[PDB]
Coordinates of C-alpha atoms and ligand atoms in Angstrom, one line a residue:
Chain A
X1 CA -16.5 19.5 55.0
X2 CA -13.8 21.3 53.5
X3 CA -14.0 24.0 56.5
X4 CA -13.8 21.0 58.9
X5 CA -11.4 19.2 57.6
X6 CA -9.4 22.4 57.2
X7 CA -9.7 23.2 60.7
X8 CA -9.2 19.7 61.9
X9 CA -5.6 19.9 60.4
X10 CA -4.7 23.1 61.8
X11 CA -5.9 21.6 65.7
X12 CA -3.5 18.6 64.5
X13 CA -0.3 20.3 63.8
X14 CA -1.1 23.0 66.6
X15 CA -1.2 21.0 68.9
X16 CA 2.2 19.3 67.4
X17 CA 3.8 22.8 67.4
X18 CA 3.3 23.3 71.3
X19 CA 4.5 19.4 72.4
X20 CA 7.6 20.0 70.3
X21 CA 8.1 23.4 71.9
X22 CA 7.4 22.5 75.3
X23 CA 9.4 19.7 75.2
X24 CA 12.5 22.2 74.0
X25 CA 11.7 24.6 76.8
X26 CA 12.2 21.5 79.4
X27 CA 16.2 20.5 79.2
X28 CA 17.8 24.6 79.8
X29 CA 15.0 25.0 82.9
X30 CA 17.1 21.6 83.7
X31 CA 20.5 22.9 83.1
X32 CA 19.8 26.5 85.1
X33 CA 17.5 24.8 87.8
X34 CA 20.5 22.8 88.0
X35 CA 23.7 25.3 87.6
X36 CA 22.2 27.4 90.2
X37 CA 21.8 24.7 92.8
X38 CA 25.3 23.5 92.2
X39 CA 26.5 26.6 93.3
X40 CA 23.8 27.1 95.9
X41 CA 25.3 24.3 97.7
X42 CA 29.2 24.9 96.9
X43 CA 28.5 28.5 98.2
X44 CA 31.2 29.2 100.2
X45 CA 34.3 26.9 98.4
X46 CA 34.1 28.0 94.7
X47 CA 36.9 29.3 92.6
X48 CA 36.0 32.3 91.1
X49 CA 36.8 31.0 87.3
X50 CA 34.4 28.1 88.1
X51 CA 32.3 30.6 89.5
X52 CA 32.5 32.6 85.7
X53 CA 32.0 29.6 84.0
X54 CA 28.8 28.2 86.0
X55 CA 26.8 31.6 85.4
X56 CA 28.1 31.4 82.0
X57 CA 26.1 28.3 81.5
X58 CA 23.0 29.9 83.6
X59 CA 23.3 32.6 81.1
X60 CA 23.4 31.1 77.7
X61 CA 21.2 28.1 78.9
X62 CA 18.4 30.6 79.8
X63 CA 19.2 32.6 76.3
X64 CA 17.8 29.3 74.6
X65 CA 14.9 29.3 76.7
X66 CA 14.2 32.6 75.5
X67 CA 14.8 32.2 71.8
X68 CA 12.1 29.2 72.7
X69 CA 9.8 31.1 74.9
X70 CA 9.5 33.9 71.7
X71 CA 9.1 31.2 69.3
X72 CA 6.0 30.0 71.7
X73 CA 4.8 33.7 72.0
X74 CA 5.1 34.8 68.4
X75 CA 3.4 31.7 67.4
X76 CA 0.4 32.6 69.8
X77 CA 0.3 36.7 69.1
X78 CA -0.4 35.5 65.0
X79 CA -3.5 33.4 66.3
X80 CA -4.6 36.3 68.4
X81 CA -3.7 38.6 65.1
X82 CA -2.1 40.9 68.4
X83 CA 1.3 40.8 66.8
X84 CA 3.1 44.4 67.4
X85 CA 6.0 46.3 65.7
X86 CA 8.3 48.8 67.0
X87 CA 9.7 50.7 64.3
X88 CA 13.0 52.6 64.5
X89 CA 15.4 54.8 61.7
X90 CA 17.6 51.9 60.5
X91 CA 19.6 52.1 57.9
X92 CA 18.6 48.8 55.2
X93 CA 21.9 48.2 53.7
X94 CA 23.8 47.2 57.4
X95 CA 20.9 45.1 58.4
X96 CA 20.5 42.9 55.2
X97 CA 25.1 42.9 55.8
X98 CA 24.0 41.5 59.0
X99 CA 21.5 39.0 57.6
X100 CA 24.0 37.6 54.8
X101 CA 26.5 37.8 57.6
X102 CA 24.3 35.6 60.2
X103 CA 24.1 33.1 57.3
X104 CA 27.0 32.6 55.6
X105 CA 28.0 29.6 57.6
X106 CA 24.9 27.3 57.3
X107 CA 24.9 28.0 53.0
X108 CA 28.1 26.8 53.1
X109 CA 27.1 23.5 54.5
X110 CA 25.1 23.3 51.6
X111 CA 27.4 25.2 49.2
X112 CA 25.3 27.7 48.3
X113 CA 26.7 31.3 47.8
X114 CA 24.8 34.3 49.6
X115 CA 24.9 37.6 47.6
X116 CA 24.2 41.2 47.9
X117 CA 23.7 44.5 45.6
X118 CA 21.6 47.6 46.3
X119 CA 20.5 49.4 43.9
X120 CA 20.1 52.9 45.6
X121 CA 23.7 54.1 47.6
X122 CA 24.1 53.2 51.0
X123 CA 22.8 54.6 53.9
X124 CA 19.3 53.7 52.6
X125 CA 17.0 54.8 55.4
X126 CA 13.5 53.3 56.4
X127 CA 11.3 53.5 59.7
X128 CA 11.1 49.9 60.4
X129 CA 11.3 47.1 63.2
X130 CA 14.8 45.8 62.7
X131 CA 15.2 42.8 64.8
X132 CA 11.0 41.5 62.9
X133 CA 12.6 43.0 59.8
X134 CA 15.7 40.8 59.8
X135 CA 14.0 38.1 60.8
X136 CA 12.0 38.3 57.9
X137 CA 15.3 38.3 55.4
X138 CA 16.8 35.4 57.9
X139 CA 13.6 33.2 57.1
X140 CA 13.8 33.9 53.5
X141 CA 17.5 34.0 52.9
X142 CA 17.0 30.3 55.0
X143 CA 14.4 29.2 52.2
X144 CA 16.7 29.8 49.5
X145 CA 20.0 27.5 51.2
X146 CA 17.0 25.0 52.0
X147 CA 15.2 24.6 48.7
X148 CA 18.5 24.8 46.7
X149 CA 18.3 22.5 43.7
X150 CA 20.3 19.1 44.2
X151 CA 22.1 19.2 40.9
X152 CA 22.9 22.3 40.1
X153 CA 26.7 23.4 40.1
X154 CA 26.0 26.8 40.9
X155 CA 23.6 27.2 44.0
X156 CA 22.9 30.9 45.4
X157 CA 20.7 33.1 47.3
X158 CA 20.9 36.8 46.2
X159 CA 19.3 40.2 47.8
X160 CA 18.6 43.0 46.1
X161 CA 17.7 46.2 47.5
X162 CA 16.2 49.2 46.0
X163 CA 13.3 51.9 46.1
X164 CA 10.3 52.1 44.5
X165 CA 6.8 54.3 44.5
X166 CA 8.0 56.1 47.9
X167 CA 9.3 53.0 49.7
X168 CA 11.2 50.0 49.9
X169 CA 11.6 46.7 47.4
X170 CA 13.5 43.9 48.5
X171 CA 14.4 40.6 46.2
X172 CA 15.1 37.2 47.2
X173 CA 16.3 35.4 44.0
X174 CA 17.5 31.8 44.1
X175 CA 18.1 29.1 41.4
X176 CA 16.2 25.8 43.3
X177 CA 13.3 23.7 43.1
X178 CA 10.6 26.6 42.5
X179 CA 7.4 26.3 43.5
X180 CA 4.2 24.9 41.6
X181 CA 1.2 26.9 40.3
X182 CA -1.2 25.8 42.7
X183 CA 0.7 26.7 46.0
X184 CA 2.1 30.2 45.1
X185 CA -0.9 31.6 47.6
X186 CA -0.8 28.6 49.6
X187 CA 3.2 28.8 51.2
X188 CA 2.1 31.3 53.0
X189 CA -0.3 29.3 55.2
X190 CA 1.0 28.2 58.3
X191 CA 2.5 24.7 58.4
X192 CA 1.8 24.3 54.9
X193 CA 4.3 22.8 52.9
X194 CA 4.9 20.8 49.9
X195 CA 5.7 17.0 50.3
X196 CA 4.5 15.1 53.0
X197 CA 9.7 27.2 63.8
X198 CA 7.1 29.8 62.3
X199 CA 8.0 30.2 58.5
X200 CA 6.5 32.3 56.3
X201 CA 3.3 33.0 57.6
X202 CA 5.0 35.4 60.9
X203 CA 6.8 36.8 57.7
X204 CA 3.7 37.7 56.0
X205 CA 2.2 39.0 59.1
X206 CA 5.4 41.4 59.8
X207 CA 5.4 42.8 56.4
X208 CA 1.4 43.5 56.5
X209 CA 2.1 44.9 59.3
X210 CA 4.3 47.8 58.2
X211 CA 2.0 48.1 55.4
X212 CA 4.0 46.4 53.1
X213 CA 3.2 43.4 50.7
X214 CA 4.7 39.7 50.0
X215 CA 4.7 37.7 46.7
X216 CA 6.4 34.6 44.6
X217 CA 7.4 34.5 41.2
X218 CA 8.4 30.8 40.2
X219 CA 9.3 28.9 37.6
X220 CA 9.2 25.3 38.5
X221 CA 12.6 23.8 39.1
X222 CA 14.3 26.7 37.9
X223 CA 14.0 30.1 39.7
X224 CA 12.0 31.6 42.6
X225 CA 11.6 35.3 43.6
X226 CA 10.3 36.8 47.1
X227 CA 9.2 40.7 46.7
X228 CA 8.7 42.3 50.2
X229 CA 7.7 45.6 49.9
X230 CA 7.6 48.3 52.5
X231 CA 6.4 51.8 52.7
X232 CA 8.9 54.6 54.4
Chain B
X1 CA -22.7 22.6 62.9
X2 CA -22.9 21.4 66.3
X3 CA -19.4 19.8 65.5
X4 CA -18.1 23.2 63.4
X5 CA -19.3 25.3 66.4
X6 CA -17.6 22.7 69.1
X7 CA -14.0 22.6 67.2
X8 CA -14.4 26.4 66.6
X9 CA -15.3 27.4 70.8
X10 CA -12.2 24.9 72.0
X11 CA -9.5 26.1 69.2
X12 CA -10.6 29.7 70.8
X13 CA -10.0 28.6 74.4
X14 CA -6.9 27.0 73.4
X15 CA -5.4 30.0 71.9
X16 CA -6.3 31.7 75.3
X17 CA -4.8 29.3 77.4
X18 CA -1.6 29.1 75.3
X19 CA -1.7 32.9 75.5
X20 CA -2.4 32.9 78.8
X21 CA 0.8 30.6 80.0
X22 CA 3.3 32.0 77.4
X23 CA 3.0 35.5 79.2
X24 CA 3.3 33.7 83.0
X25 CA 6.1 31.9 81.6
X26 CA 7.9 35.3 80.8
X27 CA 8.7 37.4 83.6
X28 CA 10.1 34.5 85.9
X29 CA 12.7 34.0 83.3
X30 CA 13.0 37.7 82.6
X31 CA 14.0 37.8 86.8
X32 CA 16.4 34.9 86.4
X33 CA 17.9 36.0 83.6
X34 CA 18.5 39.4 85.4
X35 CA 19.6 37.9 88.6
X36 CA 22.1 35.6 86.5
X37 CA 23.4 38.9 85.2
X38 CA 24.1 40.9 88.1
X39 CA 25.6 37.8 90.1
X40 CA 27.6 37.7 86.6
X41 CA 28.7 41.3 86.3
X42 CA 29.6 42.2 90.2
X43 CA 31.6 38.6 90.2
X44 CA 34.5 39.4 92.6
X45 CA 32.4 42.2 94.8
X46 CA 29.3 39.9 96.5
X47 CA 28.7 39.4 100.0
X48 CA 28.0 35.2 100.8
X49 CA 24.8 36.5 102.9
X50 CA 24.4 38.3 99.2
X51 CA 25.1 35.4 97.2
X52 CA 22.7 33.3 99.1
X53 CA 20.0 35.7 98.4
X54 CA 20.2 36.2 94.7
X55 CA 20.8 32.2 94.1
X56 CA 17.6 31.9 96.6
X57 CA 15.3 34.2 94.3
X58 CA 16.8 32.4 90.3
X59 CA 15.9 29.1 92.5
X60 CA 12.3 29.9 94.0
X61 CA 12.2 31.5 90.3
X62 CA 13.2 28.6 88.3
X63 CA 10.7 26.5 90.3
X64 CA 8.1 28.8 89.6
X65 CA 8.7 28.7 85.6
X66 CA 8.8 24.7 86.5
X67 CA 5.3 25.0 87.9
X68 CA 4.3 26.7 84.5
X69 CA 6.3 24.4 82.0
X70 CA 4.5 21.7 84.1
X71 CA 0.8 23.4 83.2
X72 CA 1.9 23.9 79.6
X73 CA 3.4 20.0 79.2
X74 CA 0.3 18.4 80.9
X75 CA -2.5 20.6 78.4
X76 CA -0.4 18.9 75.6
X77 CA 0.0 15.4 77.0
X78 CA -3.9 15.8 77.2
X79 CA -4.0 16.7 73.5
X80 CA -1.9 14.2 72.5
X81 CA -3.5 11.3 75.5
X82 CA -0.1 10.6 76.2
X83 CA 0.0 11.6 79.2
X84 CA 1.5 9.1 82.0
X85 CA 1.5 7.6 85.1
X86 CA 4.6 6.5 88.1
X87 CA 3.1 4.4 90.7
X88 CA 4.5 3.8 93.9
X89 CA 3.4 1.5 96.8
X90 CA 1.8 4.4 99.1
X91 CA -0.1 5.3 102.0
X92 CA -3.3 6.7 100.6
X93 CA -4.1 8.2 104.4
X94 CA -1.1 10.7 105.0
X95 CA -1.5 11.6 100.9
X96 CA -5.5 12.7 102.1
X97 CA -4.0 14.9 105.1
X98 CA -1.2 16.1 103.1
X99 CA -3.7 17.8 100.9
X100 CA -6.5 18.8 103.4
X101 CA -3.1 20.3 105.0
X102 CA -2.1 21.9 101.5
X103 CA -5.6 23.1 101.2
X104 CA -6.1 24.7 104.7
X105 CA -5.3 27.9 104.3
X106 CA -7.3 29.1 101.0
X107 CA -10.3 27.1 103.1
X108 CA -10.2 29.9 105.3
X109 CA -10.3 32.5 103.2
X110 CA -13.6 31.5 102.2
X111 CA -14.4 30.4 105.5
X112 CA -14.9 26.7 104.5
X113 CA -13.9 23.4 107.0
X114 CA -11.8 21.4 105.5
X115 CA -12.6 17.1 107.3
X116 CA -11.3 14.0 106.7
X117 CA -12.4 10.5 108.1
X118 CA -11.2 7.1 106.8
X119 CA -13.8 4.2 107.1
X120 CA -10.8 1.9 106.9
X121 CA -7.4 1.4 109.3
X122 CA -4.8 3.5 108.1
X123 CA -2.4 3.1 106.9
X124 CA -4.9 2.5 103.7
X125 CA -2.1 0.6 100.7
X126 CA -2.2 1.3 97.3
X127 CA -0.2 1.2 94.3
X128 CA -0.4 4.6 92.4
X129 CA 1.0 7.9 91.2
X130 CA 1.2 9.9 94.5
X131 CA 1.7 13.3 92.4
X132 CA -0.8 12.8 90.5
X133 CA -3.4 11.5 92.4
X134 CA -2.4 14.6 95.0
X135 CA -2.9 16.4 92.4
X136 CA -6.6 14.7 91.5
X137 CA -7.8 15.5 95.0
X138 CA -6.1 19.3 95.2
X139 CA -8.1 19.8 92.3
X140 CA -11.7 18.4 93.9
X141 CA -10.9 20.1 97.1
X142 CA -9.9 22.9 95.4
X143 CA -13.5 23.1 93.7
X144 CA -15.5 22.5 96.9
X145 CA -13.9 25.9 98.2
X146 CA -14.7 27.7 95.4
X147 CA -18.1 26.9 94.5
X148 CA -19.3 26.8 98.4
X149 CA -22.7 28.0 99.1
X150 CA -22.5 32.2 100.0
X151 CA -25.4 32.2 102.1
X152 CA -24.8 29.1 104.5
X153 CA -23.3 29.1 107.7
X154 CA -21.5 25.7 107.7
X155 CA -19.4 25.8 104.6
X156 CA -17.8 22.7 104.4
X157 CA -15.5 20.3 101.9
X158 CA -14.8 16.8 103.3
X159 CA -13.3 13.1 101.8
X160 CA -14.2 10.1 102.8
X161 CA -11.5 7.1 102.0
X162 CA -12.9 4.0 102.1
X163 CA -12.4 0.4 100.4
X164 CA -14.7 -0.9 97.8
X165 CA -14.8 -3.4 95.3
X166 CA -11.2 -4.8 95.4
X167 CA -10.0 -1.3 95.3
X168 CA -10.6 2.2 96.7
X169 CA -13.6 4.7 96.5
X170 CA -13.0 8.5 97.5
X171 CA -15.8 10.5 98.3
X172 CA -15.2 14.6 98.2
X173 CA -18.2 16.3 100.0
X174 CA -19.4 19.7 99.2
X175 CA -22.4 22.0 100.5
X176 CA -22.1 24.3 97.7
X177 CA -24.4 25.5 95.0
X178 CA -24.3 21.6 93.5
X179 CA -24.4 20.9 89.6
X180 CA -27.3 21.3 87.1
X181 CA -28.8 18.0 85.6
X182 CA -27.6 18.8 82.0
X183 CA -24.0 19.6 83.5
X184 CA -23.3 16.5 85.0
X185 CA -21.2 15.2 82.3
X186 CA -20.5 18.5 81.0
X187 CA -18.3 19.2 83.5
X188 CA -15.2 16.8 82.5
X189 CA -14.6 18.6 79.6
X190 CA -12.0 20.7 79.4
X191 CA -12.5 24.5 79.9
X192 CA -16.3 23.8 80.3
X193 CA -18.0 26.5 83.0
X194 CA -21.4 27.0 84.1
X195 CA -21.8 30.8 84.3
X196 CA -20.8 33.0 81.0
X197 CA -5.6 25.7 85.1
X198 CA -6.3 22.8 83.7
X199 CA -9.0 21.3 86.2
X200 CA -11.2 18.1 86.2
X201 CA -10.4 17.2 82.0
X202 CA -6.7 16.1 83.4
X203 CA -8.1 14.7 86.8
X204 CA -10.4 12.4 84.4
X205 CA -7.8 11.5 82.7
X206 CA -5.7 10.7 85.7
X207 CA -8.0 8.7 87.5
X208 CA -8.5 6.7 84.0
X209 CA -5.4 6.1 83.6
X210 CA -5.3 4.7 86.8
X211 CA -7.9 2.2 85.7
X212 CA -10.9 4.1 88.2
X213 CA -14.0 6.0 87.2
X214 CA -14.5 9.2 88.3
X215 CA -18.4 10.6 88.4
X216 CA -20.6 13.4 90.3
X217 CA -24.2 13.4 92.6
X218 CA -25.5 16.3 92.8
X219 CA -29.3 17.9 94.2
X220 CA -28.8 21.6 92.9
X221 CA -28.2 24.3 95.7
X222 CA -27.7 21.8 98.4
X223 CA -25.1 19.0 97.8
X224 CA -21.8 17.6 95.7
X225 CA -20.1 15.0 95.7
X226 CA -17.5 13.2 93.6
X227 CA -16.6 9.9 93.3
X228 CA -13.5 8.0 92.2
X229 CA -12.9 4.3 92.6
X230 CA -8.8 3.2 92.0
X231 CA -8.2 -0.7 91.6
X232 CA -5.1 -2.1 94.0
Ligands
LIG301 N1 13.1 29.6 48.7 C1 12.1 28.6 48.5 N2 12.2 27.8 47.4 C2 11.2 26.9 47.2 N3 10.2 26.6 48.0 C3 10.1 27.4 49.2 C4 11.0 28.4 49.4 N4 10.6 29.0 50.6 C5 9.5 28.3 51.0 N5 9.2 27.4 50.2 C6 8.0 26.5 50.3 O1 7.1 27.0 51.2 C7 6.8 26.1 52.3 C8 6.7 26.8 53.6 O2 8.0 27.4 54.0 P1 8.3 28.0 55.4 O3 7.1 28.7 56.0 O4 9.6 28.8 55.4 O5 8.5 26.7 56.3 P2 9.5 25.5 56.1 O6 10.7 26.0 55.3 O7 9.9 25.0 57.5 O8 8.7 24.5 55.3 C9 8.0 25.1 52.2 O9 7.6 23.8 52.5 C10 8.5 25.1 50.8 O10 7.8 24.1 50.0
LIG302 N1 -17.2 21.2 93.9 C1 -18.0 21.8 92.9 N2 -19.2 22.3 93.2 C2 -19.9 22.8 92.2 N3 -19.5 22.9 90.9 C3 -18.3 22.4 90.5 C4 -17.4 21.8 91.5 N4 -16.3 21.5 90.9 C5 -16.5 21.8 89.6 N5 -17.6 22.4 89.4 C6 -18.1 22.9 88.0 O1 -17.3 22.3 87.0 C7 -16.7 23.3 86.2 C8 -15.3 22.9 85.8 O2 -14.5 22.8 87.0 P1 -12.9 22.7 86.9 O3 -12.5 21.8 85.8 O4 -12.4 22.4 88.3 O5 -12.4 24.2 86.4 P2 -12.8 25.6 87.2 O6 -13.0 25.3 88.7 O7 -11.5 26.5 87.0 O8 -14.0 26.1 86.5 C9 -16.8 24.6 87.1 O9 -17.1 25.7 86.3 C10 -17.9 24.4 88.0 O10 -19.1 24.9 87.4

């Protein structure tokens, strides 16, 4: 019964995922369906910097419906385990920039600093996927502004790169709520969480996937530590 | 175990449908998206004959991805039985040769006869959801095509309106390969076959929600037919 009621969860909050995502997916097919028959009709009489600014819209609308339509296909290639990776020479210490970068507004919001120190010199090279690579740092670095701890003056999320046994360590540290002893294996489950779109299992699954391994070290309420570790 | 092997089969075909749709869902916007861009890039340069054409295709485009979304929202709503109904005072006689005229063409690829007969004046009143009740008997009809009898000469898939019972009965007649006696109820549920896209699940549903019944007669290798009865 603990297999069914395991599996009875899962349908449950699957079957959330996809009416939350399909709903998402409806309002920009709206907005371009809609753009594009705006100017459809208005064919001949538009000005040329209304023109711009209408496929503008048509453009970033269907951008969204991308971002959404890769959420709804990443979340469907982990179920099918048929997740792929296409590695390319990229240089680490740019892309995690990037990353911090991408980020720095949102910690602010919650005034928590972002940090960054490798400990190898820059260029540090590795044959990885960079876009499922930083999106791995981008969910963890997330974590970290998210989990901060409410009363603590100095709230940051720091990554430290470095290389070790023929490959690549990277170090999320962060000062927040930790995480307790029972759910260190358990975070990694998809959905899971810990009071009652993809998270940390598509993390887990990109890692393993270049070989690599994932792990927590926590201290409950005071620190918590993400190793990703990746092969070159 | 019965139960264990049941949730374990339909979380299997659900990840296939899901994976299924996700990938149809793709290329449309991948052609829309492109089309945006190109209108977008040569802004000043286009022909209105040109124009016309490219706003044609990210139109007939968007309403194919509609089509899609549509498939994916109304698995979930099934999910979730929340799916819902827009009734409309309509003639149920032009909604019956609306289909068999929606229908005709795939009839004769498989050489079927597609008949209707009303054993009441038209036009036959009723309050309900023309879309969806279109869709209820696209689906039927639909079936009788497909599961016609190979080896007989007078392939044939015909509805009978009628009005019973302070309401309306629909009869869809089939000379097919009929229906097993174990599969009689079998085949409402969703993604259920007989031999080893959403179908009659959401057309039971439909009719339901309508306040009908929907149900099947059928001798094996010579007859179908399916029944729904719809309240005024
Ligand atoms: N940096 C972190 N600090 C504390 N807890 C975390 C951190 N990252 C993840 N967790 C825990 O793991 C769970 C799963 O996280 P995740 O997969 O990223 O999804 P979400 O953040 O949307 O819950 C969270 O509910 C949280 O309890
Ligand atoms: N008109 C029909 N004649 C014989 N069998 C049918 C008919 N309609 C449906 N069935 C049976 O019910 C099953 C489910 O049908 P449906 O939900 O329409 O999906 P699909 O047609 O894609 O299988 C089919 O596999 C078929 O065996």
């Amino acid at each position: 019964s603990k297999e069914l009621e395991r599996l009875k969860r899962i349908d449950r909050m699957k079957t959330e995922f996809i009416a939350n995502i399909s709903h998402e997916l409806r309002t920009p097919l709206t907005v371009i369906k809609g753009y594009a028959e705006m100017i459809y009709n208005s064919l001949g009489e538009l000005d040329l910097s209304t023109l711009k600014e209408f496929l503008e819209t048509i453009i970033e609308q269907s951008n969204h419906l991308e971002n959404l339509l890769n959420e709804l296909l990443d979340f469907s290639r982990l179920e099918r385990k048929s997740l792929q990776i296409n590695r390319e020479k990229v240089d680490l210490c740019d892309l995690v920039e990037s990353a911090v970068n991408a980020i720095k507004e949102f910690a602010s919001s919650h005034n928590v600093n972002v940090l960054f120190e490798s400990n190898v010199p820059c260029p540090v090279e590795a044959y990885i996927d960079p876009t499922r690579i930083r999106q791995v740092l981008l969910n963890l670095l997330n974590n970290g502004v998210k989990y901060s701890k409410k009363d603590a003056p100095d709230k940051y999320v720091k990554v430290i790169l470095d290389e070790k046994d023929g490959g690549v360590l990277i170090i999320v540290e962060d000062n927040g709520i930790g995480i307790p002893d029972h759910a260190k294996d358990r975070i990694f489950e998809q959905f899971y969480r810990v009071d009652s779109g993809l998270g940390l299992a598509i993390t887990k699954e990109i890692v393993e996937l270049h070989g690599g391994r994932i792990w927590v070290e926590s201290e409950v309420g005071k620190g918590s530590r993400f190793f990703v570790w990746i092969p070159k």
